[PDB]
Amino acid sequence: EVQLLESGGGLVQPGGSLRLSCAASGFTFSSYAMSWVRQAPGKGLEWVSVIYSGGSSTYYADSVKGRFTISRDNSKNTLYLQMNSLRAEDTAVYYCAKDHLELSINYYYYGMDVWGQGTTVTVSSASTKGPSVFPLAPSGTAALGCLVKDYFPEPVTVSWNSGALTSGVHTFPAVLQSSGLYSLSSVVTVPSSSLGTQTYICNVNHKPSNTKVDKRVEPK
Amino acid sequence: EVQLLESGGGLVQPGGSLRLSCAASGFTFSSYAMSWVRQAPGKGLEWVSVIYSGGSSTYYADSVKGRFTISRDNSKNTLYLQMNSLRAEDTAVYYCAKDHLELSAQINYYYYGMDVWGQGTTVTVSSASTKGPSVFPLAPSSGGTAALGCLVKDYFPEPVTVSWNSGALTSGVHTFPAVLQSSGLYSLSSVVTVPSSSLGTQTYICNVNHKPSNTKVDKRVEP
Amino acid sequence: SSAAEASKKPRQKRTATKAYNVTQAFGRRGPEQTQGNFGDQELIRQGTDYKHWPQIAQFAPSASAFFGMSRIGMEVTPSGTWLTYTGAIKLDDKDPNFKDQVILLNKHIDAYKTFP
């Protein structure tokens, strides 16, 4: 059971600091270099930093050099990444990965065959904020909905008629605005003949801010 | 120089027949297999037939087997393709190509790609009848430029040429390639862009000539 | 067909698979100088589909290395003209895979000698 477990990710403001850790087991940890690899949301893999087996030598990508410090505790079989002066573009999932073996010095490498499952680092100035909900009124099939604007952080749940309406309901994944806040919409397709006779209420819950808002969506 | 010169292409009706010929020079034609390769308009290359160096053995693609006959006259350095039972889908440019060399040891075949091609001859198989075109004026619709044109519609076959003012007017002239409609007839448009202030004073006449129907027509294009 | 004969790849450019095994592509294994001697029954039947083919192919030279490392000569006999090649590839005995590499290679060198 070769395994790497990361922790320490979280939400921090720009200029803040985080300490990531990666606990290894199932292999002779002290014989291998170890690397950190990160992946910004929707971007590619970027190697970040490496420390050699004995912890004597370290190297860093230019994007993090002078701000991140990698270290290891071979007695604990744990790898660390001390992240200082965080920037918004440091937002990523940070992966722990076994690097090349070194024997005595020769270096042997057969790919990064062991990865951790990653820990998420979010660098943002956003504060917890409950959403503002606006009805998306409809005009025999019609689409009405609810706009859920400017909330932080994820997630927001949307039901319709307190869950009694489930067919035709489409809740879309949120967009992350340049403001750092999220917005999503939930649209439900219903028969036209019901628009004047059936009430349609979207129920919006945002647990982090303790907000629940019900919005009646009436036709114009 | 090595050279293949095709001839015999033309316009034929479905079920008709046509004979292509390819004259070779610059190499020992009699030592080489020869192939016909065709290309329908806008489609890919399709090998259709080969005849071996002695003219005794022939092979055909399934699409032309039983309808095309390939032959050669080594005393004339000439390759032939007799095309019978022609169909619309036989419309293509037909290429003459040098195939593998045959050496008599067991006969051995040596091939380094088709490095020698003719420039091709065009074959059109269409049931449509020859017809002169109908010309219509595309009146200029009201920063200082106006576009006026002529619609040359429902003619067969190609080509038709369009000039403006007996050819004196060339700048701003854009004659578009013809469309080939489901009816089997062509339609094209020729547009000229002129100063807007010239509209009330200068005369613009498009000259349409469809030689296959002896149709010559001048249409004034007035606002 | 003439086109199949004219475009048929020579022995050095062929690739053995399950559908075209080592015997079909390169002849039976044997002791003669122009016979191959490499491969057990499994590799012979499977070619590049063999489970451990990547670990064998790591020792095969590229076209540039083949002419770069080897001693190249030309023999002319009544049977024809031949481009001869000899060479040696050093294994890394410090590589953690070295022991497995030697076992795998010895499993196929002259494996036909023990064929039923």
Added chain:
Amino acid sequence: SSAAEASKKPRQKRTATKAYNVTQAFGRRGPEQTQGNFGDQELIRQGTDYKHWPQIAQFAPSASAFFGMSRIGMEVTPSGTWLTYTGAIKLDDKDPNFKDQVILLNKHIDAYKTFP
């Protein structure tokens, strides 16, 4: 760097170009059994960028043909363990290009002996 050393290709997997010639990739040409002997100064200098390289590479065996045609051996010595290979690639003396092939191969075989 360790990453460059850890991923450095072995001798047999290298490819010689103008940016990395035959001498740098496969050592100097010479008569010793361990040395390559193939190539004139142009091929030495240009590698696979050589104008007639495709005419030479047509004789290089694929990975499957290398282990299919060649006589493979293992030499376990105090100075290391080697994969040894010997073989012959038959030319077609009836091919129209045969005479030019012999000339091209002869021009590069042991060409280092002329080098001033």
Added chain:
Amino acid sequence: SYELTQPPSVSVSPGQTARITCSGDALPKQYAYWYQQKPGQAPVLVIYKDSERPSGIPERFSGSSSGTTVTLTISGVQAEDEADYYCQSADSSGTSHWVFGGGTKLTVLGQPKAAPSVTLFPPSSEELQANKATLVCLISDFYPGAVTVAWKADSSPVKAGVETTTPSKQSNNKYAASSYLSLTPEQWKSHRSYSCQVTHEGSTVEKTVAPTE
């Protein structure tokens, strides 16, 4: 710095052979390594040293090297093979560590093409009474999962105030997205209409709203 170049996207049908290339000046001297990553998962090594498979990887994965280009090949590609693929290598200069290529999204087309359905909502009267205006373009039921969205003021393009999501796989395995156009209520009322134009597979489907009634 040293860079590896791979195509951003490759599309294949099931059973066909998928090919993903990666190029870099040091690849004639340095081995390459290939990684497969599915959404929400860590990368998985599929090929090391140009052409070797880790033990758990299916035999349909293979790799080859031709000078400055390496190619990851997946024969008889399956729907399970749809993922992002990254090549990895190192400069030969010996002054840096591992570098990743930009990544290749391999799409395995397991469904016929489907144009997106577009639903465009005008700003709510409640939102306008809050001195704000948001246009909501909801895009659904398209395949493959890639669209581009353009907004128009009347017939003129607008670039400011547009926020669009990445495509997301719906329950029915078709894809969905959504775009938002932020305007001032004065802008929304000053134009005759606003339009959301969704281009999918080179063809565009549009919807238009107007400050009417």
Added chain:
Amino acid sequence: SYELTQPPSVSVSPGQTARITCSGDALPKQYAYWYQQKPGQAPVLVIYKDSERPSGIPERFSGSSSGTTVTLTISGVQAEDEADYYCQSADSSGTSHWVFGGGTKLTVLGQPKAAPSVTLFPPSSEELQANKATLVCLISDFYPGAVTVAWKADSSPVKAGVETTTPSKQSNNKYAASSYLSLTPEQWKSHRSYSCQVTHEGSTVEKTVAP
């Protein structure tokens, strides 16, 4: 029938490496041959026997083999390398002759992206006196040479009677195409407007006419 499979099209930028693949079951045993064809010209052999260049072909053309796939590679691709490329080989069964792949259109993108100029002409008066009506959408000066035409009848798409040409190269090295919409003289005089929408590299261009 023995088939060779190529992708319909490959798009590159100058200096990049173009790669055109050809797949066939008999390629492990049979050589492949590559041909380059520019519009209105006969094909030209660029690679034979998988990897060899004929005399006169620039060195940036190369070829390689990997089992059932052969690849034609153009390093540092240039604008003059834009053409249709065909692979050719033969079945190993020995019952057939040469077969060509379907062909790959290689676009090189040697010019700046140019959006099309569009001019939509309504039916002429003389044509209406002849019980006919044709809308004429003239599309010019776009690059690269690929567009899609959407015909609308008051924000409603009419998909009948549309004749659209293939894009054609102009003398200024941009592209042109034309689309025709044949209607009855009553279809045209009843609708409130009529549009020609042209989509080119995402961005769109539209003109409108009305009686």
